[PDB]
Amino acid sequence: RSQQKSLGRQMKILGNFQLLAGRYVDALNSFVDAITTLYKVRDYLWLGSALDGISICFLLLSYRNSISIAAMQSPRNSIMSLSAPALNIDVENINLPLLIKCISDKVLYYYDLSLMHNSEYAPQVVYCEFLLKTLTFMTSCYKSSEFSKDVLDNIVKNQHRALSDIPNSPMFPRFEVYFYSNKLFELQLKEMQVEAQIKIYSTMAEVYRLLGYKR
Amino acid sequence: PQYFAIIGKKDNPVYEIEFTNAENPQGFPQDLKELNPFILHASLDIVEDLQWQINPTDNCYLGKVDHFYGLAITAYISYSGMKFVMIHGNSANSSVVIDDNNMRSFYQEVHELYVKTLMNPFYKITDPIRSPAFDSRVRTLARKHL
Amino acid sequence: VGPKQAITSEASTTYYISRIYSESLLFKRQEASLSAMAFLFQEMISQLHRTCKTAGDFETKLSDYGHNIGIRLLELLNFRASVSNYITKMRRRDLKILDILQFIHGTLWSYLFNHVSDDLVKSSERDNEYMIVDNFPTLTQFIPGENVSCEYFVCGIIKGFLFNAGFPCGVTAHRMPQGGHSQRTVYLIQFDRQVLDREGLRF
């Protein structure tokens, strides 16, 4: 299990590092200091996609339960960012769809569909984080919460699919299961930190005011 | 620990009442104020965007509809304008029990008590009911179906 | 359960059957003469020409009676037609406009005047306007209807059949002798744009 832990920590750090260090703002593309990245105008997370693909493969082969949903977070962030915004119709997510076949939530071929599917997959994997009983991000090691990361997980979910139901029904509509699938705060939420509560209630209120559900 | 409401068209409660089982002998102490209009105000929101469509052949009765993080709510929509809401549940357990047909024989059964009071031509719309008899009737009509 | 007071009450562990006044509500039949109700309507219109200034305010001060009892006739006419009270079910509500103006056409006139108004014509040029014609209006047949201000009992009574139904609606009457049936009155009703646009979301 030591090989699984070593590969887990190295793959998570390498996935986040090559994610944030490829195409951070690439509309001027200062090509000097090309050590850590390609950093040209055509450098949009392609090595980050290959590294995240190998990272998700080695994470599924590691077999974690707590840190393993961060691999799905990395692949979902890859297929969101480098296969939506600065995509230029590349969308190289073949091993990402292979990991969707292997772990969870295959069989989708659209924008705002496979992202929702892999978000459900990562939510199910974080539900499968039953009891890690340790410290992984070591900002807090005795008074911390798996609540404090799971609220950030589903608010990433809520901000990244609640806008797709355009207030004006005709444009891009789906069924109003956003409130139905929004009632998921069964957890206690009694003041781990006040600004987490403020941003969670600001977004939870703002989506109801967006969808016209005032009360 | 049961809480009845009849809430009107311009958000006014034309009849709202609580009662308690004596096996609880009180009702929702310190929770009786968040389980009031705000939860019911959002219940008006969900029956507002649930009535006007055909599809989420019994258009009036709707059964259990939503759930805050302590209990769950039920509903009924009449074509008089009014939207009947009963709020039930012992506060210790998460009360699951929706009988769904015998308390369907409450909403169509309390409906006529609203009908005969609406047929009082001195009684207007958008004003509450201080009947001393129709509120004593409904708890005994809830003595049929607890 | 007063507005001033809270929703407070007592426990369920007794049985207070001290009740006074609740009865049946069924379709009774007693069928008074048209002369009696015609005299009732007659002295009502006499009071309204006494107390009111001009045309349009008198038209509103006639249609308010229809708005008083239109809600009342709506809910138990529906509770008798689409449904003591050993109740099977209550059937479907208003789906759209064209079932609820069929519901005036089906069982409002035959609740009131023992027949059916002869047409429920969807208009040619527009869709917010609709038009129902009664052929020989029953409760105003004696009044010489050259002023058409005397049939706004029934424009008031159908507006309060649709204001509960969620369709706010300008409802007018005109009278036009299109047939050998004389003095037939058209109730050209309108709507507002918004529940027409709530119909106009999907139709």
PDB file of all heavy atoms in Angstrom, chain A residues 12 28 35 38 79 98 116 128 137 157 179 186-187 192 212, unseen atoms left out:
ATOM      1  N   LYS A  12      -1.214  13.382  -7.268  1.00  0.00           N
ATOM      2  CA  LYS A  12      -2.085  14.499  -6.921  1.00  0.00           C
ATOM      3  C   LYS A  12      -1.343  15.829  -6.992  1.00  0.00           C
ATOM      4  O   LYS A  12      -1.869  16.809  -7.552  1.00  0.00           O
ATOM      5  CB  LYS A  12      -2.678  14.284  -5.529  1.00  0.00           C
ATOM      6  N   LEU A  28      -1.141  36.331 -24.237  1.00  0.00           N
ATOM      7  CA  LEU A  28       0.054  37.071 -24.628  1.00  0.00           C
ATOM      8  C   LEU A  28       1.281  36.176 -24.727  1.00  0.00           C
ATOM      9  O   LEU A  28       2.119  36.413 -25.602  1.00  0.00           O
ATOM     10  CB  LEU A  28       0.327  38.218 -23.647  1.00  0.00           C
ATOM     11  N   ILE A  35      11.188  26.496 -18.589  1.00  0.00           N
ATOM     12  CA  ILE A  35      11.622  25.313 -17.856  1.00  0.00           C
ATOM     13  C   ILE A  35      10.441  24.428 -17.475  1.00  0.00           C
ATOM     14  O   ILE A  35      10.365  23.263 -17.881  1.00  0.00           O
ATOM     15  CB  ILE A  35      12.405  25.735 -16.614  1.00  0.00           C
ATOM     16  N   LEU A  38       5.670  24.349 -21.488  1.00  0.00           N
ATOM     17  CA  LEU A  38       5.849  24.785 -22.866  1.00  0.00           C
ATOM     18  C   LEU A  38       5.643  26.287 -22.988  1.00  0.00           C
ATOM     19  O   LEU A  38       6.463  26.983 -23.597  1.00  0.00           O
ATOM     20  CB  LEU A  38       4.887  24.034 -23.782  1.00  0.00           C
ATOM     21  N   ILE A  79     -11.212  18.236 -18.783  1.00  0.00           N
ATOM     22  CA  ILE A  79     -12.246  18.237 -19.813  1.00  0.00           C
ATOM     23  C   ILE A  79     -13.167  19.448 -19.728  1.00  0.00           C
ATOM     24  O   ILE A  79     -13.902  19.720 -20.679  1.00  0.00           O
ATOM     25  CB  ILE A  79     -13.075  16.955 -19.731  1.00  0.00           C
ATOM     26  N   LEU A  98     -11.680   6.310 -20.834  1.00  0.00           N
ATOM     27  CA  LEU A  98     -11.289   4.978 -20.376  1.00  0.00           C
ATOM     28  C   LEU A  98     -11.392   4.854 -18.859  1.00  0.00           C
ATOM     29  O   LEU A  98     -11.814   3.813 -18.345  1.00  0.00           O
ATOM     30  CB  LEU A  98      -9.872   4.655 -20.847  1.00  0.00           C
ATOM     31  N   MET A 116     -21.366  16.446 -15.854  1.00  0.00           N
ATOM     32  CA  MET A 116     -22.329  16.079 -14.820  1.00  0.00           C
ATOM     33  C   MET A 116     -22.167  14.625 -14.397  1.00  0.00           C
ATOM     34  O   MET A 116     -22.295  14.303 -13.209  1.00  0.00           O
ATOM     35  CB  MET A 116     -23.748  16.332 -15.321  1.00  0.00           C
ATOM     36  N   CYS A 128     -17.803   7.225  -1.030  1.00  0.00           N
ATOM     37  CA  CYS A 128     -17.045   6.015  -0.737  1.00  0.00           C
ATOM     38  C   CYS A 128     -15.813   6.282   0.116  1.00  0.00           C
ATOM     39  O   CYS A 128     -15.182   5.325   0.575  1.00  0.00           O
ATOM     40  CB  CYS A 128     -16.625   5.314  -2.031  1.00  0.00           C
ATOM     41  N   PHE A 137      -4.376  16.972   3.389  1.00  0.00           N
ATOM     42  CA  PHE A 137      -3.988  18.377   3.314  1.00  0.00           C
ATOM     43  C   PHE A 137      -3.837  18.879   4.743  1.00  0.00           C
ATOM     44  O   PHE A 137      -4.829  19.048   5.460  1.00  0.00           O
ATOM     45  CB  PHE A 137      -4.998  19.205   2.522  1.00  0.00           C
ATOM     46  CG  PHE A 137      -4.826  19.106   1.032  1.00  0.00           C
ATOM     47  CD1 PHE A 137      -5.577  18.211   0.283  1.00  0.00           C
ATOM     48  CD2 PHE A 137      -3.892  19.906   0.382  1.00  0.00           C
ATOM     49  CE1 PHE A 137      -5.411  18.122  -1.094  1.00  0.00           C
ATOM     50  CE2 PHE A 137      -3.717  19.820  -0.994  1.00  0.00           C
ATOM     51  CZ  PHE A 137      -4.481  18.927  -1.731  1.00  0.00           C
ATOM     52  N   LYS A 157     -19.966  21.632  -8.002  1.00  0.00           N
ATOM     53  CA  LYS A 157     -21.045  21.041  -8.796  1.00  0.00           C
ATOM     54  C   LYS A 157     -22.165  22.038  -9.071  1.00  0.00           C
ATOM     55  O   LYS A 157     -22.603  22.175 -10.219  1.00  0.00           O
ATOM     56  CB  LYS A 157     -21.564  19.784  -8.084  1.00  0.00           C
ATOM     57  CG  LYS A 157     -22.701  18.973  -8.745  1.00  0.00           C
ATOM     58  CD  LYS A 157     -24.126  19.310  -8.282  1.00  0.00           C
ATOM     59  CE  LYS A 157     -24.341  18.829  -6.854  1.00  0.00           C
ATOM     60  NZ  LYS A 157     -25.706  19.109  -6.333  1.00  0.00           N
ATOM     61  N   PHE A 179     -33.329  22.184  -7.701  1.00  0.00           N
ATOM     62  CA  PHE A 179     -33.738  22.273  -6.304  1.00  0.00           C
ATOM     63  C   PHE A 179     -33.847  20.885  -5.673  1.00  0.00           C
ATOM     64  O   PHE A 179     -33.451  20.688  -4.510  1.00  0.00           O
ATOM     65  CB  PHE A 179     -35.052  23.043  -6.221  1.00  0.00           C
ATOM     66  CG  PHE A 179     -35.841  22.763  -4.998  1.00  0.00           C
ATOM     67  CD1 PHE A 179     -35.425  23.221  -3.758  1.00  0.00           C
ATOM     68  CD2 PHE A 179     -37.029  22.077  -5.091  1.00  0.00           C
ATOM     69  CE1 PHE A 179     -36.164  22.959  -2.630  1.00  0.00           C
ATOM     70  CE2 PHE A 179     -37.773  21.813  -3.976  1.00  0.00           C
ATOM     71  CZ  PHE A 179     -37.346  22.262  -2.743  1.00  0.00           C
ATOM     72  N   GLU A 186     -27.760  17.688   4.240  1.00  0.00           N
ATOM     73  CA  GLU A 186     -28.215  16.962   5.425  1.00  0.00           C
ATOM     74  C   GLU A 186     -27.219  17.053   6.570  1.00  0.00           C
ATOM     75  O   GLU A 186     -27.580  16.771   7.718  1.00  0.00           O
ATOM     76  CB  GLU A 186     -28.448  15.480   5.120  1.00  0.00           C
ATOM     77  CG  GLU A 186     -29.544  15.151   4.115  1.00  0.00           C
ATOM     78  CD  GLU A 186     -29.063  15.186   2.678  1.00  0.00           C
ATOM     79  OE1 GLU A 186     -27.853  15.388   2.470  1.00  0.00           O
ATOM     80  OE2 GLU A 186     -29.888  14.996   1.759  1.00  0.00           O
ATOM     81  N   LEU A 187     -25.973  17.409   6.269  1.00  0.00           N
ATOM     82  CA  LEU A 187     -24.917  17.632   7.239  1.00  0.00           C
ATOM     83  C   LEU A 187     -25.221  18.826   8.141  1.00  0.00           C
ATOM     84  O   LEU A 187     -26.083  19.661   7.857  1.00  0.00           O
ATOM     85  CB  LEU A 187     -23.574  17.864   6.547  1.00  0.00           C
ATOM     86  CG  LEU A 187     -23.273  19.172   5.807  1.00  0.00           C
ATOM     87  CD1 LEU A 187     -21.823  19.228   5.609  1.00  0.00           C
ATOM     88  CD2 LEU A 187     -23.847  19.229   4.432  1.00  0.00           C
ATOM     89  N   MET A 192     -17.971  25.679  11.144  1.00  0.00           N
ATOM     90  CA  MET A 192     -16.563  25.323  11.060  1.00  0.00           C
ATOM     91  C   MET A 192     -15.717  26.577  10.861  1.00  0.00           C
ATOM     92  O   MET A 192     -14.617  26.685  11.416  1.00  0.00           O
ATOM     93  CB  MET A 192     -16.338  24.255   9.967  1.00  0.00           C
ATOM     94  CG  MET A 192     -16.237  24.687   8.500  1.00  0.00           C
ATOM     95  SD  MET A 192     -17.644  25.650   7.937  1.00  0.00           S
ATOM     96  CE  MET A 192     -18.941  24.442   8.139  1.00  0.00           C
ATOM     97  N   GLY A 212     -35.706  32.122 -10.150  1.00  0.00           N
ATOM     98  CA  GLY A 212     -37.005  32.738  -9.990  1.00  0.00           C
ATOM     99  C   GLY A 212     -37.830  32.108  -8.904  1.00  0.00           C
ATOM    100  O   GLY A 212     -39.060  32.135  -8.967  1.00  0.00           O
TER     101      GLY A 212
END
